[PDB]
Amino acid sequence: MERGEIWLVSLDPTAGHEQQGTRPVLIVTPAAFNRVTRLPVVVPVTSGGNFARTAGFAVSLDGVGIRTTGVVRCDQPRTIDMKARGGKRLERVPETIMNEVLGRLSTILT
Amino acid sequence: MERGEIWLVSLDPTAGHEQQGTRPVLIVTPAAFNRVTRLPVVVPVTSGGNFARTAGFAVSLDGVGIRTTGVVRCDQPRTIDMKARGGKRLERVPETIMNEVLGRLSTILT
RNA sequence: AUACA
């Protein structure tokens, strides 16, 4: 597992109003960290608004030519289980998208 | 965050190696988001028993004079609900300790 | 009451 890779996993079961529904998550933490900690920080992919681009907490996606149709959002993230659920590797996003995600996590730290 | 907000809420339900159980948690999300989506991210507190010590990401709430004698897991935060689940603030953590937690939470930007 | 169980 490397940085910028997209792994399919489920965030459920959810309660109240969490981000429910199986979707591919993006690996935010570097391989070195994931290797020793074995707990990678991931962000959920949801909708945005009009187009699959930057929507506040949602980062831009459509433009690099990917198979995953959606918008990466760093609004409601959480370190879920990737041991019993199992992650399925799909594809990977360019460094362009990686920088986008790394700029939304700072806005939640307050 | 809003600074110094230790709320008690039920982390359940959960599945896999994720945090669960009704215990005090430290919110990370700021007022500009906590009062918007109503879905904040909380850091699970882990009781130390009679004494606690700071280590790595584990922030020690014990020492300065706090009721909650334990360490916060600034490694596995989960997005939950703070309206339907039902939460209540127990005590207010000193600004000194609050800064320590935030400093540990800065490791997720690596 | 920024969400594709």
What is B1-110's CATH topology? SH3 type barrels. (2.30.30)
Burial of B50 (0-12, 13-18, 19+ CB in 10 A): exposed
Q: Considering only CB atoms, which chain A residues are within 8 Å of B76?
A: 39, 79
Of A29, A85, A108, the CB nearest to B33: A108
Give B75's strand partners.
Answer: none
DSSP of A61-96 = -TTS--S--SEEB-SS------SSS--EEEEE--HH
Q: Considering only CB atoms, which chain A residues are within 8 Å of B42?
A: none
Rounded distance between C-alpha atoms, residue A11 and residue A46, angstroms: 12
Sorted by where each begins, the domain ranges of chain B are: 1-110
Please judge whether B15 and A110 are an interchain contact, meaning their C-beta atoms are less than 8 angstroms apart. Answer: no
Coil/strand/helix, residue A12: coil
In the block, tokens 């939470």 appear at B105
Contact call for residues A101 and A78 (beta carbons, < 8 A): no
